[PDB]
């Protein structure tokens, strides 16, 4: 066998964290049009048979809180896990409405020893966020 | 026994250290290009190949426009980071 077993009772969960409005004090500007992405992703993963859950404008605390809980759930009858992060960010960092969260932190909740229900199953993280401030000028 | 960091896939919208583009009415370049390729190919291609399609689309069909010279005519390339152990098919 060389391909992931996708015949489990269910394709799995698809968590979409869509942050559009940040606290004034963070200095972070609103991410317009992000609702279009979240609506699109929701419809696409629905037809792929994933149980989708949209969460909007979560604080750093809630983001971690959500990941912690999603990991403690039982994924025995689920084939895979998908997490989509739509927000501001920097290298290895994604912004909660009230402040930054380092990726590694929420990623660890799903690694081998931690989320044994997903062990051996594909954990996919789709991230729409900045990774710094460099601009690509292109060529030709 | 297998690595704890294994079976992970990070599909980033942009390359390491770079900005990422989002359009106010159309959505981010990455997401609208990802959903389009999933719809057309989820039932035909392996996942690593689909994302590659998404790379070509974002890289090819998008270019920023702005009155601010510093941000005008900028390109973007998504970054796939795989630590998967097998091929992934949604069917």
């Amino acid at each position: 066998d060389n391909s992931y077993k996708m015949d489990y009772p269910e394709m799995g969960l698809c968590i979409i964290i869509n942050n559009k409005n940040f606290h004034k004090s963070t200095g972070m500007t609103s991410r317009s049009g992000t609702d279009v992405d979240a609506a699109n992703l929701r419809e696409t993963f629905r037809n792929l048979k994933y149980e989708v859950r949209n969460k909007n404008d979560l604080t750093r605390e809630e983001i971690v809180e959500l990941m912690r809980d999603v990991s403690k759930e039982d994924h025995s009858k689920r084939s895979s896990f998908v997490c989509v992060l739509l927000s501001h960010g920097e290298e290895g960092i994604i912004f909660g409405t009230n402040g930054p969260v380092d990726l590694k932190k929420i990623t660890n909740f799903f690694r081998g020893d931690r989320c044994r229900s997903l062990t051996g199953k594909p954990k996919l993280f789709i991230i729409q966020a900045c990774r710094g401030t460099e601009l690509d000028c292109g060529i030709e | 026994k297998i690595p704890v960091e294994a079976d992970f896939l990070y599909a980033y919208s942009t390359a390491p250290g770079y900005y990422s583009w989002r359009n106010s009415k159309d959505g981010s370049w990455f997401i609208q290009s990802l959903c389009a390729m999933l719809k057309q190919y989820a039932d035909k291609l392996e996942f690593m190949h689909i994302l590659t399609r998404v790379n070509r689309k974002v890289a090819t069909e998008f270019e920023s426009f702005s009155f601010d010279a510093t941000f005008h005519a900028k390109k973007q390339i998504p970054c796939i980071v795989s630590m998967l152990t097998k091929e992934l098919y949604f069917y």
């Binding site: 900045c130 | 990422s20 583009w21 359009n23 106010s24 920023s64 426009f65 702005s66």
Partner: peptide
Amino acid sequence: DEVX
């Protein structure tokens, strides 16, 4: 167009 805007940046993230």
